[PDB]
Scaffold this active site. Structure first.
Site, PDB file in Angstrom:
ATOM      1  N   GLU B  63      34.132  42.240  27.005  1.00 41.16           N
ATOM      2  CA  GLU B  63      33.170  41.263  27.554  1.00 41.16           C
ATOM      3  C   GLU B  63      31.861  41.113  26.749  1.00 41.16           C
ATOM      4  O   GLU B  63      31.220  42.118  26.448  1.00 41.16           O
ATOM      5  CB  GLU B  63      32.832  41.602  29.014  1.00 41.16           C
ATOM      6  CG  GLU B  63      33.885  41.229  30.069  1.00 41.16           C
ATOM      7  CD  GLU B  63      34.239  39.762  30.137  1.00 41.16           C
ATOM      8  OE1 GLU B  63      34.088  38.991  29.181  1.00 41.16           O
ATOM      9  OE2 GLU B  63      34.738  39.353  31.170  1.00 41.16           O
ATOM     10  N   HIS B 163      46.253  26.564  49.019  1.00 39.23           N
ATOM     11  CA  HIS B 163      45.835  27.669  48.159  1.00 39.23           C
ATOM     12  C   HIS B 163      46.721  28.891  48.430  1.00 39.23           C
ATOM     13  O   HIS B 163      47.175  29.576  47.502  1.00 39.23           O
ATOM     14  CB  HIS B 163      44.359  27.934  48.452  1.00 39.23           C
ATOM     15  CG  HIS B 163      43.804  29.219  47.921  1.00 39.23           C
ATOM     16  ND1 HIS B 163      42.779  29.245  47.005  1.00 39.23           N
ATOM     17  CD2 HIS B 163      44.016  30.511  48.271  1.00 39.23           C
ATOM     18  CE1 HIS B 163      42.419  30.500  46.774  1.00 39.23           C
ATOM     19  NE2 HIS B 163      43.150  31.292  47.534  1.00 39.23           N
ATOM     20  N   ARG B 176      43.453  41.783  46.085  1.00 40.87           N
ATOM     21  CA  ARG B 176      42.331  40.807  46.205  1.00 40.87           C
ATOM     22  C   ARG B 176      41.236  41.139  47.257  1.00 40.87           C
ATOM     23  O   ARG B 176      41.473  41.764  48.308  1.00 40.87           O
ATOM     24  CB  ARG B 176      42.898  39.419  46.520  1.00 40.87           C
ATOM     25  CG  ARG B 176      43.578  39.385  47.899  1.00 40.87           C
ATOM     26  CD  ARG B 176      44.014  38.023  48.312  1.00 40.87           C
ATOM     27  NE  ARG B 176      42.898  37.241  48.789  1.00 40.87           N
ATOM     28  CZ  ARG B 176      42.603  37.086  50.069  1.00 40.87           C
ATOM     29  NH1 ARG B 176      43.355  37.664  50.997  1.00 40.87           N
ATOM     30  NH2 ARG B 176      41.569  36.341  50.429  1.00 40.87           N
ATOM     31  N   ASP B 185      23.182  34.098  47.264  1.00 39.50           N
ATOM     32  CA  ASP B 185      23.024  34.166  45.804  1.00 39.50           C
ATOM     33  C   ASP B 185      23.526  32.865  45.313  1.00 39.50           C
ATOM     34  O   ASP B 185      23.965  32.063  46.114  1.00 39.50           O
ATOM     35  CB  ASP B 185      23.807  35.318  45.154  1.00 39.50           C
ATOM     36  CG  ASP B 185      22.930  36.165  44.199  1.00 39.50           C
ATOM     37  OD1 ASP B 185      21.727  36.445  44.594  1.00 39.50           O
ATOM     38  OD2 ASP B 185      23.419  36.545  43.073  1.00 39.50           O
ATOM     39  N   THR B 224      33.692  34.774  34.092  1.00 47.33           N
ATOM     40  CA  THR B 224      34.949  35.461  34.429  1.00 47.33           C
ATOM     41  C   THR B 224      34.908  36.800  33.716  1.00 47.33           C
ATOM     42  O   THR B 224      34.836  36.829  32.497  1.00 47.33           O
ATOM     43  CB  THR B 224      36.193  34.767  33.892  1.00 47.33           C
ATOM     44  OG1 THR B 224      36.211  33.395  34.260  1.00 47.33           O
ATOM     45  CG2 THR B 224      37.420  35.438  34.455  1.00 47.33           C
TER      46      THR B 224
HETATM   47  C1  HEM Z   1      47.638  35.578  44.944  1.00 46.81           C
HETATM   48  C2  HEM Z   1      46.691  36.153  45.682  1.00 46.81           C
HETATM   49  C3  HEM Z   1      45.769  35.358  46.606  1.00 46.81           C
HETATM   50  C4  HEM Z   1      45.940  35.218  47.912  1.00 46.81           C
HETATM   51  C5  HEM Z   1      47.122  35.801  48.742  1.00 46.81           C
HETATM   52  C6  HEM Z   1      44.791  34.425  48.366  1.00 46.81           C
HETATM   53  C7  HEM Z   1      44.602  34.045  49.660  1.00 46.81           C
HETATM   54  C8  HEM Z   1      43.514  33.464  50.195  1.00 46.81           C
HETATM   55  C9  HEM Z   1      43.364  33.130  51.582  1.00 46.81           C
HETATM   56  C10 HEM Z   1      44.441  33.385  52.648  1.00 46.81           C
HETATM   57  C11 HEM Z   1      42.164  32.570  51.740  1.00 46.81           C
HETATM   58  C12 HEM Z   1      41.513  32.040  53.043  1.00 46.81           C
HETATM   59  C13 HEM Z   1      40.718  33.170  53.656  1.00 46.81           C
HETATM   60  C14 HEM Z   1      39.967  32.705  54.868  1.00 46.81           C
HETATM   61  O1  HEM Z   1      39.539  31.550  54.981  1.00 46.81           O
HETATM   62  O2  HEM Z   1      39.710  33.489  55.784  1.00 46.81           O
HETATM   63  C15 HEM Z   1      41.551  32.566  50.437  1.00 46.81           C
HETATM   64  C16 HEM Z   1      40.288  32.111  50.158  1.00 46.81           C
HETATM   65  C17 HEM Z   1      39.692  32.042  48.914  1.00 46.81           C
HETATM   66  N1  HEM Z   1      40.255  32.444  47.715  1.00 46.81           N
HETATM   67 FE1  HEM Z   1      42.132  33.408  47.438  1.00 46.81          FE
HETATM   68  N2  HEM Z   1      43.966  34.101  47.308  1.00 46.81           N
HETATM   69  C18 HEM Z   1      44.565  34.672  46.207  1.00 46.81           C
HETATM   70  C19 HEM Z   1      44.091  34.592  44.934  1.00 46.81           C
HETATM   71  C20 HEM Z   1      42.902  33.979  44.629  1.00 46.81           C
HETATM   72  C21 HEM Z   1      42.390  33.698  43.300  1.00 46.81           C
HETATM   73  C22 HEM Z   1      43.060  33.965  41.935  1.00 46.81           C
HETATM   74  C23 HEM Z   1      41.213  33.113  43.462  1.00 46.81           C
HETATM   75  C24 HEM Z   1      40.321  32.628  42.314  1.00 46.81           C
HETATM   76  C25 HEM Z   1      39.149  33.249  42.180  1.00 46.81           C
HETATM   77  C26 HEM Z   1      40.911  32.995  44.874  1.00 46.81           C
HETATM   78  C27 HEM Z   1      39.743  32.472  45.386  1.00 46.81           C
HETATM   79  C28 HEM Z   1      39.425  32.197  46.682  1.00 46.81           C
HETATM   80  C29 HEM Z   1      38.220  31.604  47.187  1.00 46.81           C
HETATM   81  C30 HEM Z   1      37.008  31.151  46.381  1.00 46.81           C
HETATM   82  C31 HEM Z   1      38.388  31.490  48.691  1.00 46.81           C
HETATM   83  C32 HEM Z   1      37.429  30.906  49.771  1.00 46.81           C
HETATM   84  C33 HEM Z   1      37.598  29.386  49.883  1.00 46.81           C
HETATM   85  C34 HEM Z   1      36.621  28.869  50.884  1.00 46.81           C
HETATM   86  O3  HEM Z   1      35.453  29.295  50.863  1.00 46.81           O
HETATM   87  O4  HEM Z   1      36.929  28.004  51.721  1.00 46.81           O
HETATM   88  N3  HEM Z   1      41.981  33.519  45.556  1.00 46.81           N
HETATM   89  N4  HEM Z   1      42.415  33.110  49.509  1.00 46.81           N
HETATM   90  O1  LIG Z   2      41.080  34.766  47.865  1.00 44.05           O
HETATM   91  N1  LIG Z   2      41.250  35.972  47.112  1.00 44.05           N
HETATM   92  O2  LIG Z   2      39.934  36.511  47.008  1.00 44.05           O
HETATM   93 CA   LIG Z   3      20.033  35.851  43.334  1.00 45.06          CA
HETATM   94 CA   LIG Z   4      35.166  37.256  30.147  1.00 49.46          CA
END
Ligand code: HEM
Ligand SMILES: O=N[O-]
Ligand SMILES: [Ca+2]
Ligand SMILES: [Ca+2]
Ligand code: HEM
Ligand code: HEM
Ligand code: HEM
Ligand code: HEM
Ligand SMILES: O=N[O-]
Ligand SMILES: O=N[O-]
Ligand SMILES: O=N[O-]
Ligand SMILES: O=N[O-]
Ligand SMILES: [Ca+2]
Ligand SMILES: [Ca+2]
Ligand SMILES: [Ca+2]
Lengths: 241, 241, 241, 241, 241
Positions: B63, B163, B176, B185, B224
């Site tokens: 990094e 998603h 995760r 922030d 990242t």
């Molecule tokens: C393959 C594994 C993953 C699973 C099973 C997963 C699953 C989920 C689930 C179920 C939620 C909804 C949670 C809730 O609202 O209570 C969520 C939200 C979220 N995930 Fe993941 N995710 C995965 C990978 C990732 C990756 C690679 C990222 C990219 C950084 C990511 C970023 C996010 C973000 C930013 C939210 C919140 C969205 C919002 O604020 O509405 N996830 N994820």
């Molecule tokens: O939604 N995986 O942080």
């Molecule tokens: Ca700050």
């Molecule tokens: Ca990097």
């Protein structure tokens, strides 16, 4: 005379927020001079007791770009300048660079007034913080785009009544101050918050994130600065070791 | 009292990610002082046994703007602050600059809960990581635009059901955790991953880049951060020579 | 055991490019400790004979934020970490800062494969570089937007077929390697070129600037790094006086 | 010969605004040499009596990226360069870095001239500043997009007619000066203001934020520089302690 | 053998602009060694009589991020690199940091050729710079969006005919050179100008801003570098005191 109660409540008051970050060569300032540092700041604030109101906040360990930051209130911007200028002559002042400065001014209510929006304005002025003293400070500069400013005062009033509705509830939780900056610094507004409940604070921001007004923000943070509330000497006492 | 397996599982937990960069003048602290840096940290973690949970990752060589970074979990942001503040007073702390900090807080499920989305929630809750212990960590802050936030809960849940569909499969591979930041922030979220299969991890993000929700990202990295998992002392031992 | 002809040819191969800039106090290293710095890098490369493949390019004089950069290829990202980490312990290593790092991994063909695009794929494998040993390297990081990724694989294939049609002809002139980065760093891809003909190479980019695919780039350089190819020991030797 | 009253009033005059920031090793210049620093600027300004007009402003304590700034006016850019170059050899000069520079040139009126808009022009020329000598200076670089420049002169005139309408009234409060920059530096204009009533200045900007012209700004500040007015030697005397 | 008249006129010529900024610890190089630094640059340029063509411009006092900048023309980029690389080992070299580099290559006419636009080709090629030896240099990087590159050659031609028209009148006033960069660096073009009339140049740029082509600029400055023309030794003599 500058009474904390009054100056925080009146229009035409200048805020000058200044984020400072200690340089590494502060660790090599002799444990002695460093420990005398807090008192020197304390003394400075007394000297300027009658020119400006001073607040100091600890962000070290919570912020990339500041170890601590001042809020200054003044009726005279030039006086705020003088204090800050003298602060930077102090031992700590000499060992910290400035990383952010926001200048703003207090004004009367533009939208949620007695005249324009009597209902919400009552909710507003007759609302009162409850519970534990706040430990956390958040400071958030906000700029809106030309598109917002190009809306009619009638249209922006409706947007701001939307802003005020889900947020009145959070006045038991969160204290707020609004400064105005367009043309004075690189931001439309400087918003100031004190709370003890960050989860609540998070919910509050989401609330406002989800309304139309958010669509016009071009700066709403950057930096979002959340640090911790203490007495001036205590902030410098924590930076000492 | 803080058990690892509890705090990583509960809501209302503060995450404080802090990416540090060692200054050159650390290669001039004598080998001996440097090699005893690792016990100093180890001893700070035991000292804060009951205040915070500490994770430390090696990023040097992987990094540009960190050699290492901490993940702190706390029931009290103020206690995260103190720990961080005390780490920066450490031999290693004194020869490193902070380059990123992300604050966040755990919440209950917003979208893929038993009530709102039973089918997928079952899938999520009843799935468990398989195979070799993860060597790599990835940390990715995410921010969605005003447009996302102004969509209705119904519209947003549909998009998160999207998603979750292609990603569930990757839980045999990838671990995760989701922290929340809006108003605390400069980011909406802080996401945390542990995997041993980076090729998988790549296929996992492409899975996500390919869906509608990716349309509202204004921050989705930057930085990242991908580094390598070790015990805290093992991270400082590595940084020493 | 790592053979240059094999590792540069296979999928699942980690690429770590890292751009370094020498610090002013490097001119103050007594010349000769400087000149013998090259022997040290040479020994480190042989020491890691079996772990990583190493390349080193000279950019001093042609780039703002680097004097030199490494290309590391590995079967195990971890080993690339160790290598770099061990290079920064080197004498040169102690006098340079990192200004850029790109992590990526090799994958099978996504679009221009025997099944999907039989004709172009044949043209690709059966194409063969002529003319002088390439003097120049170019490294270009590329990121495409949510809109690109939200296109169906059919639409994107057409677009990649469009990318590949005017570019095959440049394979006599120009050498290319494509690494994949989504989720692993702050770019979709890392692209790597070796050429002797810089006018040709400029003509090559413009061909590609003029197709629909270019419409979806949010990063396409930044930095565009063009430097000069040499053996490792020769690049350090160059950086010496 | 250069007379203040004339050169500030004529077309073809070059403005050179330069913002400097004192480095931390200035507090280590011996109190002796530091106190001697002011007279030295004073003599430098006299030495160029006949070459350039000098203004010097104090921003320390009100601005992150400057402690002081100059406003040079010259009939000859070369000469503004020589003065600046010679300033940088001064004791203060050798202890400050440049953080901003804006080059502009004065021009005859483009829109609100006697010919084109006689109505507003009468108001603009026969308007007269009242009350206290201005304590504050504000400098704002402004750049409009390609869209603005591609409107016809009729349409842009209409919009500047709209600019002038609410603003003429602030001429009792605020002094203005317009420099032009497209092609010469990274902005279309540099605006210069002096006022004693910052609240009035804020409302003046809000006036202008709220009209269609604001829709074409890609730069309108960044930085917005607001400092405090003094004599050249006073500014330096204030930097010294 | 390199003649200034031929190499500035031919296709296939590499341009390398490099902006340097002098570090504060140059003021602490013995005045003697500083005065000797000019003859050194002069001898190095003699040394490469036959490898590169060298120009050197004074920007100190007019630019934030340079005190001086080189234009190198070579038939071989590798020779430009050696030159620059040997310059950086020079006494001044050792005291300056690189702040910008642009690499570019000269090409034949793409639009306003005799074949494609006879009428304007005539205009362009017949009027010649009259007027005083130019005191000012301007250097402006230009990069156009994907929308532009995706327009047909016929559409881009029509656009460049509109660019050319207003510029014909400044043929007596302003000297121009155009290098091409897409794929060789982070800009499509580097533009180079020499003039004595900054007001005229400002009017030329305004004329260009106001045409449709300006709609496709994503970079058209940043930095816009304007500085002053002198002989290399005179530039370095200028930096000495
Ligand atoms: C393959 C594994 C993953 C699973 C099973 C997963 C699953 C989920 C689930 C179920 C939620 C909804 C949670 C809730 O609202 O209570 C969520 C939200 C979220 N995930 Fe993941 N995710 C995965 C990978 C990732 C990756 C690679 C990222 C990219 C950084 C990511 C970023 C996010 C973000 C930013 C939210 C919140 C969205 C919002 O604020 O509405 N996830 N994820
Ligand atoms: O939604 N995986 O942080
Ligand atoms: Ca700050
Ligand atoms: Ca990097
Ligand atoms: C939760 C408690 C809050 C209440 C009761 C509240 C109330 C108000 C009211 C009544 C106004 C209009 C005042 C006027 O124009 O005179 C206003 C303006 C404003 N508020 Fe809040 N607010 C709250 C929280 C927040 C938060 C979390 C933010 C985000 C930083 C915020 C940002 C702003 C901004 C930027 C303006 C100025 C808008 C404009 O320029 O028209 N407020 N607020
Ligand atoms: C002239 C020689 C070139 C040839 C023969 C060539 C060929 C190809 C082929 C066949 C692919 C698809 C590979 C796959 O999907 O598995 C590809 C992808 C790609 N090429 Fe090139 N290319 C050339 C030059 C360039 C240049 C100058 C660039 C500019 C950086 C470039 C950037 C890329 C990128 C970013 C991808 C991946 C696109 C994606 O992620 O879907 N190529 N190239
Ligand atoms: C309140 C006092 C002001 C008055 C009376 C005023 C008046 C004018 C007038 C009459 C013009 C047209 C001049 C011409 O074309 O020859 C002009 C242009 C301009 N004004 Fe102001 N203005 C005032 C305040 C401001 C403020 C607060 C700003 C914000 C920085 C500003 C920024 C500009 C700019 C950037 C132009 C050039 C527009 C263009 O390039 O076409 N003015 N002003
Ligand atoms: C005023 C005297 C000028 C003349 C006589 C002139 C003429 C031309 C001509 C004839 C071309 C087309 C060349 C070709 O396609 O081979 C061209 C291209 C170009 N000119 Fe100038 N120009 C002048 C000033 C400027 C200025 C002030 C700029 C802005 C810095 C500029 C920027 C450019 C750029 C970026 C191109 C490349 C266009 C493309 O890539 O398609 N020129 N110019
Ligand atoms: O509008 N609360 O600053
Ligand atoms: O597609 N060449 O990296
Ligand atoms: O138009 N006031 O710069
Ligand atoms: O278009 N003259 O560089
Ligand atoms: Ca400011
Ligand atoms: Ca400039
Ligand atoms: Ca480059």
């Amino acid at each position: 005379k500058i009474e904390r109660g009054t100056i925080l409540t009146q229009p035409g008051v200048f805020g000058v927020f200044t984020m400072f970050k200690l340089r590494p060569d502060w660790n090599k300032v002799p444990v002695a001079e460093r420990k005398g540092a807090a008192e020197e700041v304390k003394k400075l604030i007394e000297k300027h007791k009658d020119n400006v109101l001073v607040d100091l906040y600890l962000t070290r360990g919570l912020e990339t770009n500041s170890d601590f930051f001042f809020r200054i209130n003044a009726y005279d911007l030039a006086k705020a300048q003088t204090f800050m200028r003298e602060f930077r002559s102090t031992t700590v002042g000499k060992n910290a660079d400035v990383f952010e400065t926001l200048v703003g001014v207090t004004k009367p209510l533009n939208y949620i007034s007695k005249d324009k929006s009597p209902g919400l304005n009552a909710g507003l002025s007759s609302a009162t913080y409850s519970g534990p003293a706040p430990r956390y400070v958040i400071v958030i500069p906000v700029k809106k785009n030309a598109e917002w400013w190009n809306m009619s005062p009638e249209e922006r009033l409706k947007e701001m009544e939307v802003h005020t509705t889900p947020t009145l509830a959070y006045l038991v939780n969160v204290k707020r101050k609004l400064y105005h900056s367009t043309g004075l610094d690189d931001t439309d507004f400087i918003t100031y918050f004190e709370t003890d409940d960050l989860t609540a604070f998070n919910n509050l921001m989401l609330s406002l994130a989800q309304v139309k007004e958010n669509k016009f923000h071009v700066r709403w943070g950057s930096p979002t600065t959340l640090g911790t509330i203490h007495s001036p000497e205590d902030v410098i006492k924590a930076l000492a070791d």
